[PDB]
Subunit: 455 residues, 4 copies
């Protein structure tokens, strides 16, 4: 029989044991199928279902686990069922089964559960961001481009700006699930079942939306796994953007936020020194999940039809990612929920370097003033403000007039950060009303997606 | 000004000139918007419009292109506009314009076209496959698992098994477009526009489905780029599967297909021999597109909000991925179309190695025979046949009965590759009727997607 | 204190426990250093040493392992140490120790062992290849480009062609180790130790070649791990090449090899139908390891100095890769060793399709006749042989002359695959003497690569 | 003929034209091979030499370039040669040449040059770092882990901490070149040349260190390309780290550095803003190069021997990488050299959060005082320093005596950041003497990588 190297190489129980409940459900469905085929009398159907539920309980509480001699979870569960109903009844269940459609189907079921757990996590992070946004709706911070100060924005607008990529990720999940909800059961080894089963029925009972249109493809294609891997990589990356922001904020130089004791690691001697370990692990993790994606794609590359053992490599890179997300998403959520914001710091740094010059110029542009004329007028205002070591609002009215008769005192409406953010009242702008509408639109969108994912 | 090294590093006119018609369209739309706001008189409206159509046609014909002094396509285009309507008169157009929402928007506008050219290529490959499948309604080949001869299948079933993944990728394109169809115009540099412009209308006239919900996210996020890159990599990978099958089939050892001279390379000295260079390039390319995706996701990783110069790296990997596909998709479509299938060779190899043994077992299985007994029976039948050196079919009833009385001569209905494939009449099975329904369905689905991508 | 999500996220005991022996070695050396600096009396050195040997032994036998409350291997190991020598003696070991240089050093040592193991495996595969190359010294197979029959080559030449890249990988291992052999001990957190210890001595005691030249870099940089990941991915890729060849050869259509039962999966109904599962797992895992490399590099990207928690992500990918190879390398080595070569099939296919014509053309070119002519001569020979149907060697001398006045009777020598492959008598050629010399050379090179790894 | 699609797909003249000079040197070597074979007339021979010189000058001036009908650089160059010496003197050079060793050899040579250009760039960046380090010998900044202030370090130490990885990369370059210096000339298409040439001689005249040992492997392997790709990716990542440091430093919040006008950029938002574009483009391009590496490895995966057209995809990613680095390395080197460090700001932030208390504890540990005792003492010291809002230095002698009698006034020695950094005198430590010695060692070692890369 098999050599030691081969046995050790092919063994998959350690990661694939998570497929057991799904394999059991599959065995139940196949039990009913065999009943409808005439290959199972009633006596036999009850025997098998009883054995499967007993095995299900024993798998749940932990009484049944894989042996070293077990190659995978399926061999393990057939072994257990045989141990519970004997070989004669047990062997009755193996009629009309193939492994190639089974591994694909089970991977799909598991994946459709996992993607929804991850979806829950994403909604947690979004919820934390939205809650902090609502808790701090008026705090103004310097908006950053090239990590340099641009226009002042509401803190809420920034946080929600981290919320939207995740909503997009949820959209990706919803879209992915539709391609995932296709049952390969009935495809046999590759050529299709000869048992005369009804693939639509089998598909319906196991929670799939439809049966596959092509057995060969149903058993050979793993693009659903690749798509999942991608979506998870994308979620990881967005999380890494948020993470980067929090890490930068947490620095003593920035001091935009102060970390919670429960949601960070602290120093033994330096009493108030806290490290953003959660954010950094998220950041570092994103690379990991990107790697899982690229690796999976490399594995699927140049695959001749139909099934090859290569495809057994589909699960572990996906699995891992999910695991990481299942660790990362709630953590980050808490990390976002626990943030304390130094709003005076942010309001101090928001109008620095005469940022608001921009707004001045823009105002002039709104007033029909030529664009260049407006901008050198702004430059003049800045030069005439660093004249007194003074703000732009503080500038004498004469100067507004001495630079341009177009500069009515009305401009002051945008020479303060409050007025600056209030002036941008277009859809998606950092204006209070717009940010509020955006926030509730986020609420409704989240509700729509979560509603869209129920089964 | 800028040092030579910086200028060399920042130059992008060698790849981004393909955005020119989109920048021009955006400039016309912004002319409308600015006029709507009253910041422009009619003479100017069509002054700028005339200048922009002049520039447009001179960009199409080739008269106007980037100079070495030009940094990007935008600087080039406004240099031209300035040359065509005056130096500051052209500077009027800058009113209410930022670069950050612009680069995102233009990338999107380019991408929604690129993805549809790619979609046309994919549909061409699907078309070729479907046609070869139809032109061989009865051709039977060995089904492959581990590149070993499994159950016999229709060649049509194989080719269509290469058609469905591409259909799924088309589905992915369709889904992606909904997220790509969001305009970031009005998002300014970071915070919203303060000009009182309507992002909705601007979105409508530029061909977008909606405007962005958050300015910061709209100018910072590049996940649509990552999604596009992924979809391209997926298409490339499925193409690599098709390519692998073709490279294997083209070997003298396989001889499943004979390549066309036009679509392959060969030696003058020995004319019969041909090399599947297109499939090989597809295979090698898939890795390159995978790499584009991976690299892009690494680039988007750990980006602090909002816009950073890092994001300029969003274009080139996607561009490449499109470029390559725009080369590979028709090429492949030619290859598949020009393939001559040696039907009798595949028909000959189909029942080899006593493959049909499996079918025998299955027949027994639906007669109500235990799974292991029905399989050893098959082993016995195969062993008896091997000594005789004859096919399983050319076996007298008395041996069928000496192996098992359950083996009535009826069993022979599935000992013929024709009866073998005929027996698998389940949905997505390789039975001629089911395959026919599948092919018609592939036509209807491809047509439906094609319809779904029109604007 | 720390939340459940943070504790769960931070927990690393499931993969990092393999660092325990190395940490205990580190604590040993550190104990010695501590004494000779004057920080420990000798009863305390005895105590600490004894505690560390006890803890080492119980870690080895398995009686001591990590609890669920243990965050990492270090927390566990000093938990055990404190349980074995008390908090006052154990707490005095912490003198002049920090996490950041420690973790880097431990990873380095572990990696220096792991790479060697992998090296042993690679040498095993190389050995199997050389063995088969010796066992088949005269077997001629058709050489493949584009998976198409090019010039005939010795089977030995092909197998050794698979041997050389692995030798290059071993070279990469030798080169890698030198950068790996740099102790970061004495670097502290980042600024260096203030205990007045000698980092070079500590380095020598733990098997390093030198101490780091910069503490900050020593604790921050993980380029050695990325390099390891690359060497592993390269090994995996070469293995995937070999694997591809074996998978194609094992196909019934090719029939170049027959698989061993103990080193493949097959059926018992169809006894001589065997699947090359090992090669396939190698193929997919190659993609996996590529993924690990790309991901790790993505994780190291945009890392601000010095140490970040991001770097904790350096181990799991690398680890994984090593694990994979440690399963793959013997398996492959077994597979190659177990292969049966159908020399008659390969030999029969070698001169097919007038392959040998190219050799004849080369011979004509050597005389010095025009290259176009010789080719001119050769195509002519091909069809004069085609219509008659005789092999190029079955053409009467007079016949050879009518199509070229240069074709002498002797030219027949390169018309047999033996003489043709012998004709290529140039270094690296497929001539028997040459392949023999390169085999001997492979032996010498392999056994020299081996020594440079012994410490 | 070849179809349009195939010709479009096969075209490589847009990227491979850089190989032309190498192709000419190769044609020269080949002319020598032919001369030695006596297949050429010495009059013919120098006819060919003159022709190839002419072609060389014609590539130099630019008068000769590729046409749209030319598929690759080799076709173009032989077309040119034919146009310069006639079709039958030029037709005679074709003798004994195949492209499969040609392309690999040319790629190898080009790579041996490109790797040295990159090398010079890296050395420039290192030199800039050393320059800045020497320019600031006593500057003290807050050491960072988790982007949080830890132990104070010299600015020079940080910059050099960025210098060392690049030195390692130069070492990787040195190691790589030795595997790159293996000539595949004489390997023919696959089985080796039959011309009776001396591969060693060709290898000598073309600048290689040795000739290949196996023709098949010499033509099929591309692991040199993969390794080059890796080295370039690694360099890009270290550069990404430096870049991240600078981007963060350039923030108004940090204010560690101020950017130079010629090595920085001005937003289109405000003119008084200077963004660090060079660093950001380095940061993203790092991801790009990672993508090139991963993609290349994916392409090389599952490649059956020998040459496949897949391998044509070896060049473009590698090329890309080189190009990117050739833009990045000087730029960065300028960026670093142009940096103005706000040393007083950093010095002000250095002793913050009572970080020096760490040092305090460490001092005690060095006195003979055990660990926990020392940290108890440090904690208490922080608690007093803390009540009056005073530094640990400010506290009077009596309070220190009270915390622990081991706190002789000698302790202040490390309560100043200067004495803090001066306590760390071990190799790699932030002690000025040690940092100086490190700098000198860096100088000579860099001069050693530069010596090693000169031929």
């Amino acid at each position: 029989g098999p050599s030691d190297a081969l046995a050790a190489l092919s063994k998959s129980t350690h990661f694939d044991w998570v497929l057991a409940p799904y394999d059991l459900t599959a065995s139940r469905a196949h039990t009913m199928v065999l009943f409808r085929a005439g290959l199972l009398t009633e006596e036999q159907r009850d025997g098998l279902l009883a054995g499967l539920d007993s095995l299900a309980q024993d798998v749940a509480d932990g009484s049944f686990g894989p042996l070293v001699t077990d190659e995978d979870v399926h061999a393990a569960l057939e072994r257990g069922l045989i141990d519970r109903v004997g070989p004669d009844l047990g062997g009755r269940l193996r009629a009309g089964r193939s492994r190639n459609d089974q591994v694909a189907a089970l991977f799909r079921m598991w994946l459709r559960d996992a993607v929804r757990r991850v979806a829950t996590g994403v909604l947690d992070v979004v919820g934390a961001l939205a809650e902090q946004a609502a808790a701090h709706p008026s705090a103004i911070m310097p908006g950053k481009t090239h990590l340099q100060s641009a226009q002042p924005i509401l803190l809420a607008h920034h946080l929600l700006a981290h919320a939207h990529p995740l909503l997009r990720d949820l959209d990706r999940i919803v879209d992915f699930d539709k391609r995932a909800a296709v049952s390969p059961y009935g495809s046999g080894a590759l050529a299709g079942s000869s048992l005369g089963l009804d693939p639509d029925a089998i598909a319906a009972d196991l929670g799939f939306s439809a049966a596959a249109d092509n057995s060969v493809d149903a058993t050979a294609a793993r693009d659903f796994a690749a798509e999942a891997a991608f979506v998870f990589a994308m979620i990881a990356v967005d999380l890494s953007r948020l993470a980067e922001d929090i890490i930068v904020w947490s620095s003593t130089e920035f001091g935009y936020v102060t970390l919670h004791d429960s949601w960070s690691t602290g120093s033994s001697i330096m009493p108030q020194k806290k490290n953003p370990d959660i954010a950094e692990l998220a950041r570092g993790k994103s690379g990991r999940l990107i790697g899982n994606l690229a690796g999976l794609l490399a594995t699927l590359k140049a695959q001749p039809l139909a099934y090859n053992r290569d495809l057994q490599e589909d699960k572990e890179p996906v699995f891992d990612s999910v695991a990481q997300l299942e660790l990362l998403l709630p953590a980050m959520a808490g990390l976002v929920a626990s943030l304390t914001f130094n709003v005076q710091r942010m309001a101090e740094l928001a109008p620095a370097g005469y940022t608001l010059a921009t707004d001045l110029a823009e105002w002039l542009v709104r007033q029909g003033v030529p664009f260049r004329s407006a901008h050198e007028a702004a430059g003049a205002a800045v030069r005439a403000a660093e004249q007194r070591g003074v703000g732009l609002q503080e500038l004498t009215d004469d100067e507004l007039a001495a630079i341009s008769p177009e500069l009515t005192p009305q401009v002051r409406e945008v020479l303060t950060i409050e007025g600056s953010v209030s002036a941008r009242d277009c859809r998606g702008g950092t204006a209070p009303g717009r940010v509020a509408e955006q926030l509730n639109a986020i609420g409704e969108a989240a509700e729509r997606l979560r509603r869209q994912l129920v089964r």
